Each structure stands twice: as C-alpha cells, then as structure tokens.
Amino acid sequence: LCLSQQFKAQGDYILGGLFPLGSTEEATLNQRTQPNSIPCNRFSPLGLFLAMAMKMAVEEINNGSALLPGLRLGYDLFDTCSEPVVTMKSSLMFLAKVGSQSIAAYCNYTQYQPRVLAVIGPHSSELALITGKFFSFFLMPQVSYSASMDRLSDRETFPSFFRTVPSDRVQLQAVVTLLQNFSWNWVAALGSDDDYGREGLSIFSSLANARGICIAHEGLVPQHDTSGQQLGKVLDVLRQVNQSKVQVVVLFASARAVYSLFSYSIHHGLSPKVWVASESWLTSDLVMTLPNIARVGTVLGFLQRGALLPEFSHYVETHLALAADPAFCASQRCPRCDDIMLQNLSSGLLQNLQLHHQIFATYAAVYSVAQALHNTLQCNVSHCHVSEHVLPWQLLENMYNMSFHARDLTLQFDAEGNVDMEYDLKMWVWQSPTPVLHTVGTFNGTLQLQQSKMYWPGNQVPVSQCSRQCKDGQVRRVKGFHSCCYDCVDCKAGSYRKHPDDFTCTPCNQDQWSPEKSTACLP
C-alpha cells in the first residue's frame, strides 16, 4: 500500500504532527552508547487512525471555501515512537529553516522562517512536557489532542501549549461538586501506585481541602496481583477504610487495580460502600466479570461527551482501498505501514475504539489552528490578505481569544489554553442481568442532576457527614487525615466544659458539683 507516502502534502502553509504512529521492541530499551537512529520497526494501530483523522480534517478544510479561501493547507507527519529521542529529533526538524534541514542558534529571530506553521502535539503528557519546553521558546503554537496532566496549563513555563481535551482538574472539580451536592463531607481516597494515581490523589486532596471536604483516609492500591508487597497493602487499606467509619470513597485508578481489590473483598465479605470512579475504571466490561459485584454497592462516575464523527470509518476504508491500487502512485516515517493489510485493519479495530473522542479531539485540533490562520489573515468570505507570509508567533497572538467549530460542537480556548467541554454523570446499574451505565445528570460547570433517575440499593440517599460543629456542652475531638473535622464528646459529670471555644473539660472543685454537659460547676 502507498500509505506512508500519503503522510506529506504540499500547501501554502504546513502543519506538523506528532502521533503514536510507531514504536520499538523491548530489546531497544537499553542504555545507549552511540547516537544511532532508533529502530522504530514495531507497528501500532492507534496512531494510524489518529493520523487519518488529521488527514480528513485537512481534506475538509481544503475542499470547502468556508475556511482559508483560495489557499492550500498542507502537512507532514512524524511518529513520536513513544520515545523522547525520536520525538526530539522530529521537533528539531519542525523548527528548521524553510528549504533546509538545519536549525539556527541566532541571538534574534525577527525574520526567521521555521518550516511549519503549527504542531499538533504528542499523545502523552510526558512528551508534552518535554516538547512544550522547546516549542514555547520559539513561541510555536502546539495543540495537543490528548494530554490531560494539569501542569501544562501553566502559562509561565508553557506560554504556547494548548489542548483540545479537559485537564484532570476539570474531572476532579466535577467529582468534588458531586460530593458537595449530596453533602458527602467525610470520605476516603485511593490511587493507583503509578504517576496517574498519585497525581489524581494530589489534585483531589487539594480540591477537597479547599472546599471544606474532609479526607478521612488516603491510600494507594496496586494494579497487579503478583507480589506480597501488593497483596498486603491491598488488604490493609480495606481494613483501614472500614475502621474509619467512612461510607463514601473515591478511586483514581485503572480498572484492574480496583476490581482486584473488589475481588479480594468478594472473597472475605466486605461491607457495602459508595464508590466514585474515574472513567479509566468506570469502563465496565472487564469489571462486570465479578460474579457477585452486587456486594460492592453503588458506583458513580463522570464520562466525557462530544459529537463523534459520523463518517470516519468509511473514509478510512476508502483511502486504504485507494492506497492498495498500484496506479495510485501517480497521485522512513513508518517501516511497516505500507504492508499492514486492509483485512486486519478492518472496521473491527475502530469499532473496538472506547477512545472515539480522541478521534474527535485530533480532528478538532486541526480546525483550531485553521481558524486561527483564517483569523490571522483576516480573510474575507472570498479573499485572504496573503501579501505577507504569516509566522507562528503571529498565530499565537490570535489563539487565546478565538472560538471555532468542529461539526455540531463549538469550542473556545480559555486563558490557560484548555477547551471547555461537558461531562455526563453515569451510575453503574448491576440489578438488570444486562448491566447499564445509566445517565443521571451532566456537568457543564454546574452539576445538572436528574434526581428521579437515581438508583439506591435501599431506596435511600447515602450520608457520610461529619461533625464540624459541636454543642455548647461538647468537646471538639479532632479527626481526619487532615485536622478538618471533629467527633463531639459530651462533657462528663464531675467536670466542667468551660466556654465552648476551648477544647478540654476540667474537674470541678471539692465544694462544687456539675451534671453532664455543664459549662460550669454548681456549689
């Protein structure tokens, strides 16, 4: 197939792309000793679909006059290879001079032309940091279709990074709004023992403390069942949560980790609880394999929503069919993309893909740059002011304030580079033999619940409040992983409570006596 030739197209302006379009074997993970080129000979399917989404977006923009009339938008794509070195090589290539394979170390750049207008950024947060600290020096606008880690919103260190997906902070703001709205003021938190779970805990604890939610217990869970160090902790946290008298718990982890814990519980009869799920766990297929999951109790979570593309599969298959025609040549980046055949790349793969929204985000990304160019040229309905060739920093000047369209959905970047898009709230029904992720509300900045659709196991609203106030006659005995809440103790007879802002009861004198809960002693 002619596939790898199709990843480069001419035009007046050119977009760069970094995709997980290749990879390398385990044998290549050694410490390097000579700066040879990396053998990215290990093919990957997901990057191909994301790159085809980008190609389709550019084709739409080039066909319709609605954007950039009278000029052509081009591109050439590189694979990240999930490797920092290859990603850096490609990023260095993007900033080379037009018509040359070299980059200048000048003192100033007032008339310097890099060979691309914008870069559609890498698939992972690690590479997003690594490359954002480089592109933003040249003020090259980089638009990432999937990098949700919080740190990249910092405008001080990343003055030119943008993304078409919400950050983790948005998801956890939705979670905290849910906790606030049902007055679940006293909760526990778990995270997987990887960077994802630790960062989830780091964000959630800060947000909860900021909004007056009190964390009873923080812990972590393994996503494996292979060592004593994992087994011991995964049972330990199960003991500790019960001892804390908590009823609501938040888990920020991958599916295996959570159901591993549940499975252990299912063995030894854990009590029911309310569990709040990250979408990486809420995806139900492999978890519903548990034969008695009804013992767990209610599970809730938020899921991203967006207008999926209605015709992407037909486009992919059509252009693969075109790539198979040997005459199509009349019309390396990947050692093997030319040989992976249509049959194994058939619709089954993209139907298995729940990451369909990342196909949208890659599509939306392109438009965000295209619109930004359309604004920067101040184009008419049928004219553009092409008298001068635009440079990336002039594009950057125009992106923080724009609005753009992606099919039915409409989007804007905010002042720290994120787009704002809504979430569904879904409850995990197991009662029917066929389980259901039933929608019960939405988050669009405010949690529009739909109460009548809620399921509870006993038809009762769970409650997990804690006493942040106590009576005049009660001692405020502090508790919590942070000292945010109290459990009230009645002041015993024979002692006096003093004024309620003090924290300890004291014995009465010999000639005095006091009943229970008294502030002061009687004679």
Partner: protein, 514 residues
C-alpha cells in the same frame, strides 16, 4: 572577557550568574532573553571562577594534558530562563547552524562536554537535548533523584550526592537529638514539593511526626510586596508561633527567603532550630542579615569542605558578560575567603573529571598526546570509567552516575574573622550514616539541647492512648487497681492480676493479697 578561551578542545559551561524567580522563559520581542537585567548572584560568579581556575591549572600543569590547550566557553543561564539557546549554540557548527542529520555518530559540535546547570529543571531541559547527541554533561549541584534514571538521562553525571542522602542526613540528625515533632516549609516550585514529599516518605517510617507543612509564597527580594503577600507571610509566621514544634525544615530556593525571614524578625519571633536544605544552607547574602542570630540555631546540610590551595588568591555569543559581578563580589570577598570551598569543589572536580577522560581518550602519554577528532559520545564512554584522587579524595562515578562525596552539617556563626559556616557533623552516603557530631552552641538558657515533642513520656504503670493521626501524640492513663502495665509486651493496654494478687493504682505488677 572571562567567558572565552581558545583551545584544541572546548568545554561548555552553564552557570547562573544572574537570577530571577519568575524570569521570562520565551523569546522576548523575538530576541533571546537578555540575562543582564536580573540583578546579580555572587555565588554563581564564584563557581564560574572555580571553573576558570580549574582550566588554568589544567593548562599550566605539564602532566595532565601535555601539548593540548584546553579551552572553554561560558554562557550564563539565569535560573530557568535562557535555556535551550545555549544548548543550540554549543551543538551548532561554527556558522551557528545545527544540521538535523539522521545519525550523529560522525558529528562534531563546538564543545566536547558541558559543565551543566546548577538546578534540576534546567538540568533536565538541557539533558533532553544532549541525550540526543550523547554529548557528556556533568552537573555540580542538581540533587533530584529523577536524574538517576540512566535510560531517561544516559549522558548525565553528577559530582554531588542525590537528594535521598540529604533527606537521610536530615532525618538521622533529627533522630540523634530526639526531635519527634517538626515543621516543614516548602516553596511553591518543584524543588520544594518534590523534596517535601520525599521527606514525607522518610519521616513516617523512622517514627517522626511532621506537625504541618506550609507552602511559602514565591516572592522576589528586590520587589516590594503587596499587602496580600504580607498577609500570607504573617499567617505563616503566626502558624509557627502558635505551634509547640520548634524545629523548622526549609525547602526553597535561596532568593525567596529574604522576605520570609525579614517578616519573621518583624513578628518578634525567636527560639527555634532552622534546618536548611542545600539550596540555601550556604548563602553569603542571607547570612549577612546578622540579626538572624536572634531567631535561634541555624543548621544546614551541604557539601563537605575541601580547601582549594590558591583559589582565593586567584579570585582577587550573547549572555557572555557581567558588569555587576566584580563590584558585587568585592563586597563579600572577605566573608567568602574565610569559608572553605564546598560547591566550588564540585565544579572543580567535574572539570578535572572531564580533563582525565579526555587525557585517556586521546591515548595520551606524558611526552605528548596524539591529537584527533573527539566525537563527544566517545568521551562520555570514557568519562564513565575515570577514577582518581584530586585533593586526598577519590572521585569516581556510581553505576548510576553520582560521585560519592561526603555530606556535612554546618552551623551558622556570626563572629567575623572566623569561618561563617562551621562544621558540626559529617555524613557518609556509601555507609549511609551520620557520624562525628561536635559541640553545637544552642540558643537555650544554659546551652541544653532544645527539644520538641508532641507528648511527655508516661509514668510507670501508665498506658498510652493515641490522639489524632500523629502517632507521636497520646494521652497517658493509669491502669486501674486489679490491672497493670506490662510494658514488656504492650504500651497501649493493660493486663489483669491473677486471683491471688491485686495491684495498686499506678504499678506494673500485682501484690499478693490477704
């Protein structure tokens, strides 16, 4: 100017001569950030002169590189600002163009090695470039543990122990003096939170309770504060004064502290032990606020002293100049002179390590070396293998890239004409133990060791019951008659007397009854 010397092989240098805590990271009006305007940092100029002295010795010494002129070129990286471009400058050809080749095995940059930045984020920002070329880089003061992953950073070496050993030294110092109850302060940047979390993972297992942790605002010393930041600082100091924990551990860049301590003085605060991380345990500028002597005892973990003979006498294509440095350093020169070299030795030993690596790679003999075209990736492979004594000290690299220098704890002393930062104890990382603690002078009424604990030890026959999450905090309650405290088996619960025996109110045992 000082910033360049020609030679047959050039070292690159990256020193923070100027510094601002919120410098501009991107092109300014499409021109490289000009470093000159971020005031000045005398410590960085001292380290730069340390490198210059090392190269002067290596050219003067007829034995280490016979017939080879070792040159250097220096660029000042103003903290995290003005990274990238110095790297592109070092890597590019003589016409300042860096070709993007498919394979660099035959490539020849300006420099054969880089004496890397002094800070973790800058070190990573440079390493993610140099790893592409496998051009060796040796950093003298970046302690982050992340820099020990050779897969991620294969070209990166250090002449200083990692952060793990600094935290271990802090915790063992706390254990020695029995400080179960501490306060931790961190800056709002990655250094502060990373070190704070690292200390969190350590303090718990050894049995020490972190009373609370507080994020300092990232203030700027030459800039007047707003009322809001003043409110935050007042809140922090009042959090300190309200607490029983009189041991305070500070993880922050040095510049953000000038205001903090000033406010601590204005709040009439006194009576605490301050434990400084390596970022500011040595600071000629902050030490000069002599009224600090009234706040309490000032201790810090730092690199060990190694006196460089003759260095103090020696000290008497953009971002390569400094007007302020000389007149600025002449004000500190006396207080610098009395302080034996500590980090200067890191810079000095790094340069000597590159010198020995090159000496071996050129196949050199004491008569003459065979000059050639040294591709940096060969020099890295040779650097990994060096081993030699520099000043009575063996320097060689771990498999994971660190030199195993000692750490040292220093007390601040304000009597001039003697060492400002005097040694109190020495920590050995390859033995992972603190040793040879000497006579600290405390602020207390009669020089008794100051103490901080959440609770007093219970009386005999009196069991503990915990309060709060902090294990160090408990209430003491007597085992009532008929029960006794079997402290040999449990401290938190009592046991009951046999039938023929009974116990008094406050005892560990039972008497035989009537």
């Amino acid at each position: 100017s000082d910033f360049y010397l020609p030679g047959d092989y050039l070292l690159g240098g990256l020193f923070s001569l100027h510094a601002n805590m919120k410098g501009i990271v991107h092109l300014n009006f499409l021109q490289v950030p000009m470093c000159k305007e971020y005031e000045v940092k005398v410590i960085g100029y001292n380290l730069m002169q340390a490198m210059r002295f090392a190269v002067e010795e290596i050219n003067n010494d007829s034995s280490l590189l016979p017939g080879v002129l070792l040159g250097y070129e220096i660029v000042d990286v103003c903290y995290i600002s003005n990274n990238v471009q110095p790297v592109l400058y070092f890597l590019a050809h003589e016409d300042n163009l860096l070709p993007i080749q498919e394979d660099y095995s035959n490539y020849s940059s300006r420099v054969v090695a880089v004496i890397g930045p002094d800070n973790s984020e800058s070190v990573m920002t440079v390493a993610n470039f140099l790893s592409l070329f496998l051009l060796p880089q040796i950093t003298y003061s970046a302690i982050s543990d992340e820099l020990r992953d050779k897969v991620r950073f294969p070209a990166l070496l250090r002449t200083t122990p990692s952060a793990d050993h600094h935290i271990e030294a802090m915790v063992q110092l706390m254990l020695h003096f029995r400080w179960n109850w501490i306060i931790v302060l961190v800056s709002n940047d990655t250094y502060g939170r990373d070190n704070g979390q690292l200390l969190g993972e350590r303090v718990a297992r050894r049995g020490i309770c972190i009373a609370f942790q507080e994020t300092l605002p990232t203030l700027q010393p030459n800039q007047n504060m707003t009322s809001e930041e003043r409110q935050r600082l007042v809140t922090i100091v009042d959090k300190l004064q309200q607490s029983t924990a009189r041991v305070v551990v500070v993880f922050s860049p040095d510049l953000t502290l000038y205001h903090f301590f000033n406010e601590v003085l204005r709040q009439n605060f006194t009576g605490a032990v301050w434990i400084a991380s390596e970022s500011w345990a040595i600071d000629p500028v902050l030490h000069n606020l002599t009224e600090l002597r009234h706040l309490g005892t000032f201790l810090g973990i730092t690199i060990q002293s190694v006196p460089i003979p003759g260095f103090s006498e020696f000290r008497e294509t953009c971002n390569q100049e400094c007007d302020n440095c000389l007149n600025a350093t002449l004000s500190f020169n006396t207080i610098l002179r009395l302080s034996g070299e500590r980090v200067v030795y890191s810079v000095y030993s790094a340069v000597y390590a590159v010198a020995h690596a090159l000496h071996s790679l050129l196949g050199c003999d004491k008569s003459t070396c065979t000059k050639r075209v040294v591709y940096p990736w060969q020099l890295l492979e040779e650097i990994w293998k060096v081993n030699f004594t520099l000043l009575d000290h063996q320097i060689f690299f771990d498999p994971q890239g660190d030199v195993a220098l000692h750490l040292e704890i220093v007390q601040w002393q304000w009597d001039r004409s003697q060492n400002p930062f005097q040694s109190v104890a020495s920590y050995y990382p390859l033995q992972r133990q603190l040793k040879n603690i000497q006579d600290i002078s405390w602020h207390t009424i009669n020089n008794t060791i100051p103490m901080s604990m959440c609770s007093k030890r219970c009386q005999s026959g009196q069991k503990k019951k915990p309060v709060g999450i902090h294990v160090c905090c408990f209430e003491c309650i007597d085992c009532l008659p008929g029960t006794f405290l079997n402290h040999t088996e449990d401290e938190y619960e009592c046991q009951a007397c046999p039938n023929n025996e009974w116990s008094y109110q406050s005892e560990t045992s039972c008497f035989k009854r009537q």
